[PDB]
């Protein structure tokens, strides 16, 4: 039910199990569920492949069930599943620092760089791979960026996009720089796009009136510096639209309060349906981080 | 297997043997002369 | 079929800037092999004048009539040529329906209306779907224009064929 | 309530379907004729003009036309070169001979072959697959690089023994095979090309590494073609016709878009990354269900 | 504050760092025997190590 | 460890109700004075289009309350408007009743699984269709090993693609009525793969084919909606 | 898990009576510490003139709520609640409830009002406790406030001001409220501003990218739901563009530096709405008392 048995069909020298129990209290992913399980499906080794797509690993992630790590004793791992509610601790190993009051998402690993490849399991060709945990703003950064990515490659040659991605890849956050390795287009992605193209033709028709012509209005109005950056976009998206002027917009006629009321609530169903391709629900609220950026104690 | 030991042996004296191999006119076996195989290393600013 | 509503819905939309009327194609085993079919990534297309070699370049000529000069360095003129190229093909939507079918039949499947003179029974082992939209420049079009196709699938390879408008509208144009 | 224009459209249906043809008569295809089109309604007019399509024919006669007085442009050339040396060409290739041979025979077996070779001509042939990589972008960026690159002066020894290091192995040739005592050319030879160590002459071998073994063959005549696009005209005994291709009488955009390397946009089944790993193509099936 | 009190010495592949930079000495070919007193100053390759 | 709920229920509604198998929803009612109405989603399964005829005069014939009645009323008002309207309590334990914080339809059950997967979480689908005259309103209750919310939807998507083109029809054919949302995704608890039982029930001397689910924990899920 | 909160301030015992009454109920606190200065709670170190409701909303979507348990001589011990557990909270919030609601947290309305929380306050210091409103009543008074602030610009005509009158007075089972106005001064707040001009930004950037992206996303495989999405883009441009003046030049053709700008801003730009998008639950009841003065309620979050 809750303590799961894991085994080992090698053994552990004093090596293996010293690298295995400074491994307390990291969070593993586990597919089935069960009991009396195996060490080859333990982990994401099976499920990892490179040239295959990293929004696959990402929605087997995300599908796949999670437990702590706590008490080797020799061919003996003690996997345990945490209770939905309930205070632990976490131990990372991601090279991402984190924060006492943000939440949490768990993301298939990137290379950071140094390229160490080395996790500190190895048995035989089989190796052991850990999902990076990582606080909830990079999560939706680095699920916006791909979903960019998907959204604007399509139907271009390799240059453009190649420049596109160069910069677009890299993400730095917190004094520490991250890169993308398999953004390679799948089924699933293009049924992602696919919803989010039905979202925003949505949210083109039933917005209102005076929502399309809104910065306009403050545009006449004030002028401020996001403001200006504002008129900017929208003035080279017009002028990507139409060469002409832009019209003052004028007292508007259709006013009714259960109109917008209606119309603006459908909006925010659809916003929300939009939002949840990137917005991934969280994993762990963190009530304590360690001071060595470490280990954490979060509530979930 | 070439591309790999010059990668290690990147060093101002290497190089300078190097060229010093193939300047003169005179071949190989009129300018080498052996002197046996190693066993010890002392690894100092200079190497006994 | 299902490309046939969305092209007719897009030259429509784009009807506009290009001036490019849609033209529904159907094709079978009398031109591509069906493993050339069942792995097909795309099609192209391009509208050629008979004078104007293009849309994509400039109508009165173009520089790329000075001829090749066998230069190592810029092989034929450049770079600039070779997207110039890749402005002159344009990109049509496409399905394949790799089983066979008869589309008097099939079409009755779907839920459409087919109102034939006569019902020839033409049968094809598979049928590739698509629509070109072919440019006239004002309202008035020319016979004389042709229309080029290009097949790609993902080895890179592609098969060329081309025919002049004017043997697509033998009977079509002149009933109106 | 307004009538969304799919159940018009499907109600609608279709006037007329109808095949058509391409100009050399090998494709026939089948056009489909909605009534609810906007061309139905848009009220077009035609018309069709005598000089019109008399130009058109003659512009389709020149895209058609462009391969072949290439080929015609290489045969004269060969005929001008073996005017210009008066007819005794030497060799460029390594196969050992016989003098106790009698080499006219082996000369009229070459004429036959020149001749085959030209009622045999192919818009897809050995010079055509040799030029189509040079139109490429990377084919003039690489040009500039090598043209940096051999025309390079010699290092003075600081970069000698403090600057990094520097680095045109064997060619990938291709070739026409022209086999007089069965009449079959061949069109489409992939061949890599190396030179001897022990003297310059060339030594060709099949693109697995298999030694290419016809130019023993009496009978047989080969062409060969390469990626800086000069110009071999091998008899056996290894002797050989040598020139460039002169492609200075066709005008640039006809070759341009006649045929062309092409250059992908991103579709299913890629890497966004340039250069990684294809996985499967999509390959839909006839065989499986479609999912 | 007021940057680059030398615009010929201060700059990466100025003057100096071509002329007292060890790295572009050894490119020009120079004699190691020698000493510089302005090195220490200029094979910033090795300050940054 | 059970939150418990004590609740008055008159008596126009304890036809079919007297079993532990039940779940009682709050849904606000048009009427102000009692504000909202423990129904039961036996009578959203009446309601549904979904579900069998015979059932339906099934529930009709078990049914002939004016409390069923003005319920189906109040119910009835809004188009679509179910899930700004529909508020789930869990299920009953014991009947003036007690409800915690499992029997179910044959018809309205179902699954897109071969139902081997050993941990299987539940869930309410509703789905509105416009291909009817205003709105067809599907219940639906499935059962799945899935568990990440998002691929769900997403599964649900290739599983309703007729619902999602009906409600795009009606978007672009009615431009004055604006649709909020297809349906509601909304998880209710998990069970096991072995106590789903095809089994029987005869309440009230009448027949039903039912679906019982024995070891169900029970966890209160929001109304997430989906297009 | 009990939290400790003291007073550096001189406190009456009638102070401390007048505190007692709030026994039960949730406070914000920014981050969890054992001990905690009192001057971090309530939203008092928030409020000001120059920020606004959205401010306290978005900083209240992360401030740890915490019930309070029992009041010493003085000190104060709170306890965090914790997932799945019961607890009892009173009905300080300015509306009643119901058995079954679903309950979220949202800052008060009536900041200085004519109660001045019941005058429990200190010198420069008012202690200030969010209200606690049923879900639906949450999500509708957050879109009355938004469509509020579209209207703060356009308040020159008299029918805008007689509809933002009918904005201001709410309705609820026996409950009415005069929304206050964001726009004050005759201009708007800051958070408002943003949040309007980013909402209606991202439908301008939908109605003139979705084009072009289901055309890119539709010369793949296509089906009925594209179509008609085309369809309904078609029928917006067939009503919209009635008087504007034709060939507006529309180009295929746009640089990637261009898309992949517009695409990263309306994606930042809807990104900062989901603190007011999307409404999380915190709380639902499983008994009222009478007179609804308190609530067993089961904590959610």
Same mark, same amino acid.
């Given at each position: 039910?809750?303590?799961?048995?894991?085994?080992?069909?090698?053994?552990?020298?004093?090596?293996?199990?010293?690298?295995?129990?400074?491994?307390?209290?990291?969070?593993?992913?586990?597919?089935?569920?069960?009991?009396?399980?195996?060490?080859?499906?333990?982990?994401?080794?099976?499920?990892?492949?490179?040239?295959?797509?990293?929004?696959?690993?990402?929605?087997?992630?995300?599908?796949?069930?999670?437990?702590?790590?706590?008490?080797?004793?020799?061919?003996?791992?003690?996997?345990?599943?945490?209770?939905?509610?309930?205070?632990?601790?976490?131990?990372?190993?991601?090279?991402?620092?984190?924060?006492?009051?943000?939440?949490?998402?768990?993301?298939?690993?990137?290379?950071?760089?140094?390229?160490? *490849?080395?996790?500190?399991?190895?048995?035989?060709?089989?190796?052991?791979?850990?999902?990076?945990?990582?606080?909830?703003?990079?999560?939706?950064?680095?699920?916006?960026?791909?979903?960019?990515?998907?959204?604007?490659?399509?139907?271009?040659?390799?240059?453009?996009?190649?420049?596109?991605? %160069?910069?677009? %890849?890299?993400?730095?956050?917190?004094?520490?720089?991250?890169?993308?390795?398999?953004?390679?287009?799948?089924?699933?992605?293009?049924?992602?796009?696919?919803?989010?193209?039905?979202?925003?033709?949505?949210?083109?028709?039933?917005?209102?009136?005076?929502?399309?012509?809104?910065?306009?209005?403050?545009?006449?109005?004030?002028?401020?510096?996001?403001?200006?950056?504002?008129?900017?976009?929208?003035?080279?998206?017009?002028?990507?639209?139409?060469?002409?002027?832009?019209?003052?917009?004028?007292?508007?006629?259709?006013?009714?309060?259960?109109?917008?009321?209606?119309?603006?609530?459908?909006?925010?169903?659809?916003?929300?349906?939009?939002?949840?391709?990137?917005? &991934?629900?969280?994993?762990?609220?963190?009530?304590?981080?360690?001071?060595?950026?470490?280990?954490?104690?979060?509530?979930? | 297997?070439?591309?790999?030991? &010059?990668?290690?042996?990147?060093?101002?004296?290497?190089?300078?043997?190097?060229?010093?191999?193939?300047?003169?006119?005179?071949?190989?076996?009129?300018?080498?002369?052996?002197?046996?195989?190693?066993?010890?290393?002392?690894?100092?600013?200079?190497?006994? | 079929?299902?490309?046939?509503?969305?092209?007719?819905?897009?030259?429509?939309?784009?009807?506009?800037?290009?001036?490019?009327?849609?033209?529904?194609?159907?094709?079978?085993?009398?031109?591509?092999?069906?493993?050339?079919?069942?792995?097909?990534?795309?099609?192209?297309?391009?509208?050629?004048?008979?004078?104007?070699?293009?849309?994509?370049?400039?109508?009165?000529?173009?520089?790329?009539?000075?001829?090749?000069?066998?230069?190592?360095?810029?092989?034929?003129?450049?770079?600039?040529?070779?997207?110039?190229?890749? *402005?002159?093909?344009?990109?049509?939507?496409?399905?394949?329906?790799?089983?066979?079918?008869?589309?008097?039949?099939?079409?009755? %499947?779907?839920?459409?209306?087919?109102?034939?003179? !006569?019902?020839?029974?033409?049968?094809?082992?598979?049928?590739?779907?698509?629509?070109?939209?072919?440019?006239?420049?004002?309202?008035?079009?020319?016979?004389?224009?042709?229309?080029?196709?290009?097949?790609?699938?993902?080895?890179?390879?592609?098969?060329?064929?081309?025919?002049?408008?004017?043997?697509?509208?033998?009977?079509?144009?002149?009933?109106? | 309530?307004?009538?969304?224009?799919?159940?018009?459209? !499907?109600?609608?249906?279709?006037?007329?379907? *109808?095949?058509?043809?391409?100009?050399?008569?090998?494709?026939?295809?089948?056009?489909?004729?909605?009534?609810?089109?906007?061309?139905?309604?848009?009220?077009?007019?035609?018309?069709?003009?005598?000089?019109?399509?008399?130009?058109?024919?003659?512009?389709?006669?020149?895209?058609?036309?462009?391969?072949?007085?290439?080929?015609?442009?290489?045969?004269?050339?060969?005929?001008?070169?073996?005017?210009?040396?008066?007819?005794?060409?030497?060799?460029?290739?390594?196969?050992?001979?016989?003098?106790?041979?009698?080499?006219?025979?082996?000369?009229?077996?070459?004429?036959?072959?020149?001749?085959?070779?030209?009622?045999?001509?192919?818009?897809?042939?050995?010079?055509?697959?040799?030029?189509?990589?040079?139109?490429?972008?990377?084919?003039?960026?690489?040009?500039?690089?090598?043209?940096?690159?051999?025309?390079?002066?010699?290092?003075?020894?600081?970069?000698?023994?403090?600057?990094?290091?520097?680095?045109?192995?064997?060619?990938?040739?291709?070739?026409?095979?022209?086999?007089?005592?069965?009449?079959?050319?061949?069109?489409?030879?992939?061949?890599?090309?190396?030179?001897?160590? *022990?003297?310059?002459?060339?030594?060709?071998?099949?693109?697995?590494?298999?030694?290419?073994?016809?130019?023993?063959?009496?009978?047989?005549?080969?062409?060969?073609?390469?990626?800086?696009?000069?110009?071999?005209?091998?008899?056996?005994?290894?002797?050989?016709?040598?020139?460039?291709?002169?492609?200075?009488?066709?005008? %640039?955009?006809?070759?341009?878009?006649?045929?062309?390397?092409?250059?992908?946009?991103?579709?299913?089944?890629?890497?966004?990354?340039?250069?990684?790993?294809?996985?499967?193509?999509?390959?839909?099936?006839?065989?499986?269900?479609?999912? | 504050?007021?940057?680059?009190?030398?615009?010929?010495?201060?700059?990466?592949?100025?003057?100096?760092?071509?002329?007292?930079?060890?790295?572009?000495?050894?490119?020009?070919?120079?004699?190691?025997?020698?000493?510089?007193?302005?090195?220490?100053?200029?094979?910033?390759?090795?300050?940054?190590? | 460890?059970?939150?418990?709920?004590?609740?008055?229920?008159?008596?126009?509604?304890?036809?079919?109700?007297?079993?532990?198998?039940?779940?009682?929803? /709050?849904? &606000?009612?048009?009427?102000?004075?009692?504000?909202?109405?423990?129904?039961?989603?036996?009578?959203?399964?009446?309601?549904?289009?979904?579900?069998?005829?015979?059932?339906?005069?099934?529930?009709?014939?078990?049914?002939?309350?004016?409390?069923?009645?003005?319920?189906?009323?109040?119910?009835?008002?809004?188009?679509?408007?179910?899930?700004?309207?529909?508020?789930?309590?869990?299920?009953?334990?014991?009947?003036?009743?007690?409800?915690?914080?499992?029997?179910?339809? !044959?018809?309205?059950?179902?699954?897109?699984? &071969?139902?081997?997967?050993?941990?299987?979480?539940?869930?309410?689908?509703?789905?509105?269709?416009?291909?009817?005259?205003?709105?067809?309103?599907?219940?639906?209750?499935?059962?799945?090993?899935?568990?990440?919310?998002?691929?769900?939807?997403?599964?649900?998507?290739?599983?309703?693609?007729?619902?999602?083109?009906?409600?795009?029809?009606?978007?672009?054919? /009615?431009?004055?009525?604006?649709?909020?949302?297809?349906?509601?995704?909304?998880?209710?608890?998990?069970?096991?793969?072995?106590?789903?039982?095809?089994?029987?029930?005869?309440?009230?001397?009448?027949?039903?084919?039912?679906?019982?689910?024995?070891?169900?924990?029970?966890?209160?899920?929001?109304?997430?909606?989906?297009?």
């Amino acid at each position: 039910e809750a303590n799961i048995f894991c085994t080992f069909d090698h053994k552990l020298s004093i090596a293996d199990v010293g690298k295995l129990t400074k491994l307390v209290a990291a969070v593993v992913p586990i597919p089935q569920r069960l009991h009396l399980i195996k060490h080859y499906q333990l982990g994401l080794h099976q499920f990892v492949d490179h040239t295959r797509g990293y929004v696959r690993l990402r929605g087997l992630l995300r599908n796949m069930t999670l437990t702590l790590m706590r008490r080797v004793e020799g061919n003996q791992i003690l996997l345990h599943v945490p209770t939905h509610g309930l205070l632990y601790t976490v131990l990372n190993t991601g090279p991402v620092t984190w924060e006492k009051g943000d939440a949490l998402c768990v993301l298939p690993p990137l290379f950071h760089g140094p390229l160490a *490849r080395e996790n500190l399991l190895t048995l035989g060709q089989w190796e052991l791979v850990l999902p990076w945990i990582v606080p909830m703003p990079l999560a939706l950064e680095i699920n916006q960026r791909l979903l960019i990515m998907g959204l604007f490659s399509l139907d271009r040659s390799y240059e453009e996009v190649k420049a596109a991605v %160069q910069q677009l %890849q890299t993400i730095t956050f917190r004094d520490a720089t991250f890169t993308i390795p398999d953004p390679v287009i799948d089924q699933h992605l293009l049924i992602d796009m696919k919803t989010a193209c039905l979202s925003m033709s949505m949210v083109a028709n039933l917005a209102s009136e005076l929502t399309m012509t809104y910065v306009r209005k403050l545009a006449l109005e004030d002028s401020s510096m996001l403001l200006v950056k504002c008129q900017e976009l929208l003035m080279r998206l017009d002028r990507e639209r139409s060469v002409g002027e832009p019209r003052t917009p004028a007292r508007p006629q259709h006013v009714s309060p259960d109109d917008e009321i209606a119309r603006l609530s459908a909006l925010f169903v659809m916003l929300r349906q939009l939002d949840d391709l990137i917005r &991934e629900q969280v994993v762990f609220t963190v009530c304590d981080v360690s001071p060595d950026n470490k280990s954490a104690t979060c509530i979930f | 297997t070439r591309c790999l030991l &010059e990668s290690v042996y990147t060093a101002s004296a290497a190089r300078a043997a190097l060229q010093w191999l193939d300047l003169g006119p005179h071949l190989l076996h009129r300018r080498l002369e052996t002197l046996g195989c190693v066993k010890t290393v002392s690894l100092g600013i200079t190497s006994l | 079929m299902e490309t046939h509503l969305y092209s007719d819905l897009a030259f429509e939309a784009r009807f506009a800037d290009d001036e490019q009327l849609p033209l529904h194609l159907v094709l079978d085993q009398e031109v591509l092999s069906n493993e050339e079919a069942e792995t097909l990534r795309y099609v192209y297309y391009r509208n050629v004048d008979s004078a104007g070699r293009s849309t994509g370049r400039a109508p009165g000529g173009d520089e790329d009539d000075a001829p090749a000069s066998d230069d190592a360095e810029d092989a034929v003129g450049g770079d600039r040529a070779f997207d110039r190229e890749r *402005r002159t093909w344009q990109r049509a939507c496409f399905r394949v329906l790799p089983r066979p079918l008869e589309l008097l039949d099939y079409l009755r %499947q779907s839920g459409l209306t087919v109102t034939l003179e !006569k019902e020839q029974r033409v049968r094809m082992f598979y049928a590739v779907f698509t629509t070109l939209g072919l440019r006239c420049p004002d309202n008035r079009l020319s016979g004389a224009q042709t229309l080029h196709l290009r097949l790609v699938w993902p080895d890179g390879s592609y098969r060329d064929w081309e025919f002049l408008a004017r043997d697509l509208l033998r009977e079509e144009m002149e009933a109106n | 309530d307004e009538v969304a224009r799919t159940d018009e459209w !499907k109600g609608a249906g279709v006037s007329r379907l *109808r095949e058509v043809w391409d100009v050399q008569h090998r494709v026939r295809l089948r056009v489909l004729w909605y009534v609810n089109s906007f061309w139905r309604s848009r009220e077009l007019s035609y018309d069709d003009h005598e000089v019109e399509l008399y130009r058109a024919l003659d512009a389709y006669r020149a895209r058609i036309a462009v391969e072949y007085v290439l080929i015609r442009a290489v045969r004269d050339e060969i005929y001008a070169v073996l005017r210009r040396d008066g007819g005794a060409l030497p060799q460029r290739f390594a196969c050992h001979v016989s003098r106790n041979m009698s080499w006219r025979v082996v000369w009229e077996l070459c004429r036959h072959a020149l001749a085959l070779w030209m009622d045999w001509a192919d818009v897809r042939s050995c010079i055509i697959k040799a030029l189509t990589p040079r139109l490429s972008r990377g084919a003039a960026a690489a040009a500039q690089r090598a043209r940096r690159q051999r025309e390079r002066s010699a290092p003075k020894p600081q970069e000698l023994l403090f600057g990094p290091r520097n680095e045109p192995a064997e060619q990938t040739w291709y070739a026409d095979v022209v086999r007089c005592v069965r009449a079959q050319v061949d069109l489409g030879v992939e061949v890599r090309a190396a030179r001897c160590p *022990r003297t310059g002459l060339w030594i060709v071998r099949d693109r697995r590494g298999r030694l290419r073994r016809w130019l023993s063959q009496p009978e047989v005549c080969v062409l060969y073609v390469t990626p800086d696009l000069d110009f071999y005209w091998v008899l056996p005994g290894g002797f050989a016709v040598s020139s460039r291709v002169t492609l200075h009488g066709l005008a %640039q955009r006809a070759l341009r878009d006649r045929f062309q390397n092409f250059e992908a946009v991103l579709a299913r089944g890629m890497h966004v990354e340039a250069g990684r790993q294809e996985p499967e193509t999509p390959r839909v099936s006839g065989r499986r269900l479609p999912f | 504050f007021a940057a680059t009190h030398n615009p010929w010495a201060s700059q990466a592949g100025c003057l100096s760092d071509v002329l007292y930079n060890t790295r572009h000495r050894e490119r020009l070919g120079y004699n190691s025997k020698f000493y510089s007193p302005c090195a220490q100053y200029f094979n910033t390759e090795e300050i940054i190590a | 460890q059970a939150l418990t709920a004590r609740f008055f229920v008159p008596e126009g509604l304890v036809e079919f109700e007297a079993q532990p198998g039940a779940l009682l929803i /709050r849904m &606000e009612t048009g009427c102000d004075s009692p504000r909202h109405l423990y129904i039961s989603l036996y009578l959203l399964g009446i309601r549904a289009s979904n579900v069998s005829a015979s059932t339906r005069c099934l529930l009709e014939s078990v049914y002939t309350a004016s409390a069923a009645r003005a319920a189906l009323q109040w119910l009835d008002l809004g188009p679509h408007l179910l899930h700004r309207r529909l508020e789930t309590l869990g299920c009953v334990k014991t009947v003036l009743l007690t409800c915690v914080m499992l029997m179910i339809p !044959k018809d309205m059950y179902l699954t897109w699984e &071969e139902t081997r997967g050993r941990l299987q979480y539940v869930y309410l689908i509703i789905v509105y269709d416009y291909d009817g005259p205003e709105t067809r309103p599907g219940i639906y209750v499935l059962t799945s090993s899935i568990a990440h919310w998002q691929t769900l939807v997403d599964v649900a998507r290739g599983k309703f693609a007729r619902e999602r083109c009906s409600f795009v029809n009606r978007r672009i054919t /009615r431009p004055r009525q604006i649709p909020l949302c297809t349906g509601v995704i909304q998880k209710l608890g998990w069970c096991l793969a072995d106590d789903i039982h095809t089994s029987f029930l005869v309440h009230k001397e009448l027949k039903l084919s039912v679906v019982r689910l024995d070891n169900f924990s029970v966890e209160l899920g929001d109304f997430r909606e989906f297009v």
